[PDB]
Design a protein around this motif. Sequence first.
Motif, short mmCIF file in Angstrom:
data_model
loop_
_atom_site.label_atom_id
_atom_site.label_comp_id
_atom_site.label_asym_id
_atom_site.label_seq_id
_atom_site.Cartn_x
_atom_site.Cartn_y
_atom_site.Cartn_z
N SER A 1 54.62 95.41 -62.94
CA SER A 1 54.26 96.82 -63.06
C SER A 1 52.87 96.98 -63.67
CB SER A 1 55.27 97.54 -63.96
OG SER A 1 56.59 97.43 -63.44
N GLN A 2 52.58 96.14 -64.65
CA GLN A 2 51.30 96.17 -65.36
C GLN A 2 50.13 95.43 -64.75
OE1 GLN A 2 53.27 94.71 -69.17
NE2 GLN A 2 51.64 96.01 -70.00
N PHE A 3 50.38 94.22 -64.27
CA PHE A 3 49.29 93.39 -63.77
C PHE A 3 49.21 92.99 -62.31
CE2 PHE A 3 50.44 92.59 -68.21
CZ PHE A 3 49.32 93.14 -68.82
N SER A 4 50.17 93.41 -61.49
CA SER A 4 50.10 93.04 -60.08
C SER A 4 49.02 93.87 -59.39
CB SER A 4 51.45 93.28 -59.39
OG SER A 4 51.38 92.94 -58.02
N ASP A 5 48.14 93.20 -58.65
CA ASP A 5 47.07 93.88 -57.94
C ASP A 5 47.58 94.55 -56.68
OD1 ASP A 5 44.45 93.62 -59.30
OD2 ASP A 5 44.79 91.47 -59.10
N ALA A 6 48.86 94.35 -56.37
CA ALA A 6 49.46 94.96 -55.19
C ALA A 6 50.00 96.35 -55.56
CB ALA A 6 50.59 94.08 -54.65
N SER A 7 49.92 97.27 -54.61
CA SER A 7 50.38 98.64 -54.82
C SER A 7 51.87 98.68 -55.12
CB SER A 7 50.07 99.50 -53.60
OG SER A 7 50.66 98.94 -52.44
N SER A 8 52.60 97.68 -54.65
CA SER A 8 54.04 97.62 -54.89
C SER A 8 54.33 97.57 -56.38
CB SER A 8 54.63 96.40 -54.20
OG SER A 8 53.95 95.23 -54.60
N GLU B 1 59.64 92.07 -64.06
CA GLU B 1 59.39 93.48 -63.76
C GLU B 1 58.27 94.14 -64.54
OE1 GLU B 1 62.44 92.02 -63.60
OE2 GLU B 1 62.04 92.24 -61.45
N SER B 2 58.23 93.92 -65.86
CA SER B 2 57.19 94.53 -66.68
C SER B 2 55.80 93.98 -66.40
CB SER B 2 57.52 94.39 -68.18
OG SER B 2 57.28 93.07 -68.64
N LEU B 3 55.71 92.69 -66.11
CA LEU B 3 54.41 92.09 -65.83
C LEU B 3 53.90 92.53 -64.45
CD1 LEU B 3 54.63 88.35 -67.07
CD2 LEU B 3 53.64 90.36 -68.23
N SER C 1 60.72 90.74 -54.95
CA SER C 1 59.72 91.50 -55.68
C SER C 1 58.60 90.48 -55.83
CB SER C 1 60.22 91.90 -57.07
OG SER C 1 61.27 92.84 -57.00
N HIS C 2 57.40 90.93 -56.14
CA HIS C 2 56.32 89.99 -56.32
C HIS C 2 55.25 90.52 -57.25
CE1 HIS C 2 54.09 92.53 -53.60
NE2 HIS C 2 53.08 91.69 -53.52
N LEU C 3 54.45 89.59 -57.78
CA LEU C 3 53.34 89.90 -58.66
C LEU C 3 52.15 89.23 -57.99
CD1 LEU C 3 53.04 89.32 -62.50
CD2 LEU C 3 51.21 88.87 -60.86
N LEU C 4 51.18 90.03 -57.55
CA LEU C 4 50.00 89.50 -56.88
C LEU C 4 48.75 89.55 -57.75
CD1 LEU C 4 48.29 88.64 -54.32
CD2 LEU C 4 48.14 91.12 -53.83
N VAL C 5 47.99 88.46 -57.75
CA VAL C 5 46.74 88.40 -58.49
C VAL C 5 45.68 88.11 -57.42
CG1 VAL C 5 45.36 87.23 -60.24
CG2 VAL C 5 47.81 87.52 -60.60
N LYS C 6 44.79 89.06 -57.18
CA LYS C 6 43.75 88.89 -56.17
C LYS C 6 42.51 88.22 -56.74
CE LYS C 6 45.01 92.96 -53.41
NZ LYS C 6 44.47 94.19 -52.79
N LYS D 1 53.90 99.89 -58.36
CA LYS D 1 54.52 101.16 -58.71
C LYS D 1 56.03 101.07 -58.64
CE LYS D 1 53.59 102.69 -54.01
NZ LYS D 1 52.94 101.35 -53.85
N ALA D 2 56.53 100.10 -57.88
CA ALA D 2 57.96 99.89 -57.74
C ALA D 2 58.35 98.59 -58.45
CB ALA D 2 58.34 99.80 -56.26
N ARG D 3 57.60 98.26 -59.50
CA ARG D 3 57.85 97.06 -60.29
C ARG D 3 57.82 95.79 -59.44
NH1 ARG D 3 61.14 98.10 -65.45
NH2 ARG D 3 58.99 97.63 -66.11
N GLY D 4 56.98 95.80 -58.40
CA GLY D 4 56.86 94.65 -57.53
C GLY D 4 57.87 94.55 -56.40
N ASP D 5 58.91 95.38 -56.44
CA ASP D 5 59.94 95.35 -55.40
C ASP D 5 59.40 95.68 -54.01
OD1 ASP D 5 62.44 95.43 -53.99
OD2 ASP D 5 62.70 97.53 -54.55
N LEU D 6 59.67 94.80 -53.05
CA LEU D 6 59.21 94.97 -51.68
C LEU D 6 60.33 95.44 -50.76
CD1 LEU D 6 57.15 91.65 -51.23
CD2 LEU D 6 56.27 93.95 -51.67
#
Length: 153
Positions: free
Chosen positions: A98-105, A94-96, A48-53, A107-112
């Motif tokens: 879902s809320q702050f990842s600039d990636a569309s993923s 997961e919560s961060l 899963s990942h959290l992306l900040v663009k 919606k799946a809590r960052g799960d790729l």
Amino acid sequence: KLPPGWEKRMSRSSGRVYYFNHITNASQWERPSGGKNGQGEPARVRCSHLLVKHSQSRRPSSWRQEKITRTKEEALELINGYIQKIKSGEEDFESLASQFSDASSAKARGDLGAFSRGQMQKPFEDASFALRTGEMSGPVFTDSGIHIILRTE
């Protein structure tokens, strides 16, 4: 000794000894290992990942905001902030994501889902396959932006 990418280090202008992974950019006080050999890396991993663009992202845009204007340094500062928050126990990955990842993923809590080498951008891939299940990466830079990666399988 120590798993792939890991090396014992010390903070500059400080004495705090810690362990750093040159491949995942992860840092921790705990020694990464306490004898298995010829184990190699997993052939497939789920992360899963959290992306900040930032303004230099191959696409300065996301579902969070029409135009990404924060700089790279600002993005790194935000990434460091999310990492610290996750490590303190105040927020969960997961919560961060879902809320702050600039990636569309997001919606799946960052799960790729699961993937093999050659599917993701090289830096992201390298960090993902150097992670052990349950481990989280440090800041990882790609053309998309800066990521925080969590291996789940």
